[PDB]
Amino acid sequence: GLMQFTLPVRLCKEIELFHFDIGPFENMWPGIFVYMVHRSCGTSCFELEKLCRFIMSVKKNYRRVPYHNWKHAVTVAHCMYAILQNNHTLFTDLERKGLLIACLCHDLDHRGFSNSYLQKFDHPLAALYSTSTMEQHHFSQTVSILQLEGHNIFSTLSSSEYEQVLEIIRKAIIATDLALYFGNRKQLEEMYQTGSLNLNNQSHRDRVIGLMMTACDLCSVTKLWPVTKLTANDIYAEFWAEGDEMKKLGIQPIPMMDRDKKDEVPQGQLGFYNAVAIPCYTTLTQILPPTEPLLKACRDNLSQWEKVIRGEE
Numbered sequence: 001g002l003m004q005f006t007l008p009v010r011l012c013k014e015i016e017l018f019h020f021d022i023g024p025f026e027n028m029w030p031g032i033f034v035y036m037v038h039r040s041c042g043t044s045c046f047e048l049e050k051l052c053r054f055i056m057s058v059k060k061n062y063r064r065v066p067y068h069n070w071k072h073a074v075t076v077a078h079c080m081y082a083i084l085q086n087n088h089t090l091f092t093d094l095e096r097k098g099l100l101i102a103c104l105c106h107d108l109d110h111r112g113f114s115n116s117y118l119q120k121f122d123h124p125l126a127a128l129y130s131t132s133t134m135e136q137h138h139f140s141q142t143v144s145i146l147q148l149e150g151h152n153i154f155s156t157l158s159s160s161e162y163e164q165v166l167e168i169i170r171k172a173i174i175a176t177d178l179a180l181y182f183g184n185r186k187q188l189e190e191m192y193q194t195g196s197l198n199l200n201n202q203s204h205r206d207r208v209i210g211l212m213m214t215a216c217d218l219c220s221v222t223k224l225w226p227v228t229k230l231t232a233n234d235i236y237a238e239f240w241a242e243g244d245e246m247k248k249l250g251i252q253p254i255p256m257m258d259r260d261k262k263d264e265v266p267q268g269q270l271g272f273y274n275a276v277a278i279p280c281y282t283t284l285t286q287i288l289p290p291t292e293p294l295l296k297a298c299r300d301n302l303s304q305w306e307k308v309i310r311g312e313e
């Protein structure tokens with residue numbers, strides 16, 4: 001009840017900023033998450049004993065893969081934290097509750113492989129879930145953990161509030177399927193520009209939460225350059241392994257997953273910034289003006305990649 005989490009001064013200040021790095025001390029990450037829940041949602045949103053036991057069960061169900069790991073989960077939750085804190089009044093009590101949990105849970109039991117590889121391998125999950133394969137799995141895992149004894153952090157919610165929060169988390173997690181981002185942002189762009197965007201329209205809120213999820217999920221590109229560059233190494237460590245496994249099935253992977261084409265990384269990053277990242281944080285800034293620092297950091301990192309190609313680094 002009266003037990004607050006308190007970070008060291010440097011973390012207490014920098015955790016509020018969009019570009020915050022949660023650091024290499026894994027044992028501090030649960031406390032960092034709890035701190036963000038208490039300030040974003042309240043010290044009463046969850047029973048501390050249940051929340052702590054939810055967190056540690058979520059952690060256990062993240063694998064030791066180079067990128068799609070426990071650090072990613074907490075990193076994506078912090079970006080959401082920074083969005084919710086800078087947009088205090090735009091989001092309901094249920095939404096702030098559901099979205100930090102959704103981000104922590106969004107990649108549960110990731111194996112370091114794309115939906116496309118599961119399909120080509122003929123993985124059992126690809127039979128169970130024809131589209132957004134891993135994302136349907138991530139939500140399934142989230143429900144399973146919530147249903148463990150002592151793990152139901154939403155127990156104090158009514159039946160309709162419980163169905164509402166689980167529906168927010170499901171849409172939120174399915175939205176992290178990048179395949180769905182392109183159409184979602186296009187719809188949002190049209191709605192913003194024709195002035196039809198309406199935050200009291202539930203279908204519109206869903207779309208806006210969807211784009212927030214893409215923005216938080218890609219937030220590697222919104223860090224300071226050294227963090228962005230070193231996270232790229234972990235991302236490519238997974239992709240190149242997936243490319244190796246494509247070659248094992250007798251399929252040439254796309255250049256992005258082919259370690260033989262490491263040289264093309266800098267130009268690959270430009271395409272990704274221009275095609276995915278900048279449009280994402282631009283549409284997000286239009287809808288939620290105070291998320292401008294994410295767009296600004298994204299553009300700074302595009303500039304850094306342009307310098308790599310020009311042999312300036």
Ligand SMILES: Cc1cnc(CSc2nc3ccc4ncsc4c3[nH]2)cc1OC(C)C
Nearest residue numbers: 178218220235255256261264265268269272
């Ligand atoms: C955050 C982030 C950072 N980097 C990437 C890699 S983007 C990328 N696109 C291409 C296209 C061709 C290509 N040829 C050699 S490397 C390479 C690429 N890397 C993805 C990413 O997001 C995924 C994790 C969704």
Ligand SMILES: [Mg+2]
Nearest residue numbers: 106107134176
């Ligand atoms: Mg994912």
Ligand SMILES: [Zn+2]
Nearest residue numbers: 072106107217
């Ligand atoms: Zn993710």
